[PDB]
Amino acid sequence: MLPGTFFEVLKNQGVVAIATQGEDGPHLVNTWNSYLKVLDGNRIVVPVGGMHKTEANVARDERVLMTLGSRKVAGRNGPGTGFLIRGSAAFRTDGPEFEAIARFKWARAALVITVVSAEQTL
Amino acid sequence: MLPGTFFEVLKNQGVVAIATQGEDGPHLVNTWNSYLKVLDGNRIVVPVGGMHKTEANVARDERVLMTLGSRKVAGRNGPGTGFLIRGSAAFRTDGPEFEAIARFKWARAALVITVVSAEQTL
Numbered sequence: 001m002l003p004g005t006f007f008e009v010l011k012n013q014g015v016v017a018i019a020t021q022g023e024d025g026p027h028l029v030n031t032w033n034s035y036l037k038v039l040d041g042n043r044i045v046v047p048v049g050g051m052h053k054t055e056a057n058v059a060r061d062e063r064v065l066m067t068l069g070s071r072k073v074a075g076r077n078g079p080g081t082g083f084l085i086r087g088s089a090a091f092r093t094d095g096p097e098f099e100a101i102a103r104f105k106w107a108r109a110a111l112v113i114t115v116v117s118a119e120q121t122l
Numbered sequence: 123m124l125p126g127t128f129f130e131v132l133k134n135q136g137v138v139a140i141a142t143q144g145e146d147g148p149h150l151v152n153t154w155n156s157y158l159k160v161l162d163g164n165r166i167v168v169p170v171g172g173m174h175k176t177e178a179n180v181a182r183d184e185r186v187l188m189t190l191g192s193r194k195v196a197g198r199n200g201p202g203t204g205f206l207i208r209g210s211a212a213f214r215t216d217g218p219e220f221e222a223i224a225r226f227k228w229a230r231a232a233l234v235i236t237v238v239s240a241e242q243t244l
């Protein structure tokens with residue numbers, strides 16, 4: 001699901017954005033490109049410190065959107081690229097998906113996104 | 123209302139994320155930190171090339187969320203910071219707000235976000 005160009009983006013610094021559906025509208029939170037931990041089976045894991053509203057939204061609708069990119073990776077027509085990722089989210093407080101990000105001692109949980117599509121949008 | 127730290131973030135490159143309300147969950151698109159043009163009266167202007175789905179969503183619900191940040195600007199507790207912006211969106215195709223981003227020759231419109239709140243979230 002995730003292409004080589006996406007892993008090239010992860011070699012670079014940047015702000016990741018994660019959109020969820022709440023009752024009254026969307027919500028949008030962040031992590032860092034360098035915090036994402038990618039596992040076998042199309043999983044992207046995010047260390048969770050806050051994300052309380054995000055977690056409440058995921059209870060309502062597990063489908064999330066994620067974007068990220070880097071000016072330092074070539075897109076189709078010039079320097080810079082990024083991705084729109086769609087997948088389903090789950091929060092883990094133990095087990096190997098949590099252990100994947102447990103080095104971040106501030107993390108109360110792991111946000112595990114199982115990717116269904118990844119589109120290079122530039 | 124946009125604070126000095128937000129302008130410091132804009133001096134550095136990054137991926138901006140813009141969330142809208144779709145008919146079956148959120149939608150999420152991007153621009154670059156360096157593409158934003160900030161005008162008086164709390165207006166952030168984004169050059170629009172694509173964003174057809176985003177635009178359709180805004181026509182139904184003008185409320186948007188925007189995030190952006192930079193590893194290179196100090197947050198409250200370490201290097202790196204970013205912002206959650208909440209505001210209302212409009213798409214302009216003539217006049218001063220369109221002219222503000224018209225140097226981008228690929229632009230079909232200007233996405234004008236009138237900021238209601240800005241939160242430094244790190």
Ligand SMILES: Cc1cc2nc3c(=O)[nH]c(=O)nc-3n(C[C@H](O)[C@H](O)[C@H](O)COP(=O)(O)O)c2cc1C
Binds near residue numbers: 016029035
């Ligand atoms: C650049 C950036 C990186 C962030 N990294 C994380 C992170 O890795 N984990 C996290 O829980 N919150 C992180 N935050 C804060 C979240 O975006 C969010 O504000 C916080 O978790 C509260 O989430 P909620 O609004 O869903 O309750 C980061 C914020 C910024 C601006």
Ligand SMILES: Cc1cc2nc3c(=O)[nH]c(=O)nc-3n(C[C@H](O)[C@H](O)[C@H](O)COP(=O)(O)O)c2cc1C
Binds near residue numbers: 081
């Ligand atoms: C880092 C990055 C920057 C982008 N900059 C713009 C931009 O300035 N204007 C634009 O219309 N689309 C830009 N795009 C593409 C949009 O994110 C989006 O994929 C495209 O406009 C289609 O929008 P829609 O899904 O609302 O139809 C950028 C994409 C990335 C990854």
Ligand SMILES: [Cl-]
Binds near residue numbers: 012033034193
């Ligand atoms: Cl990073």
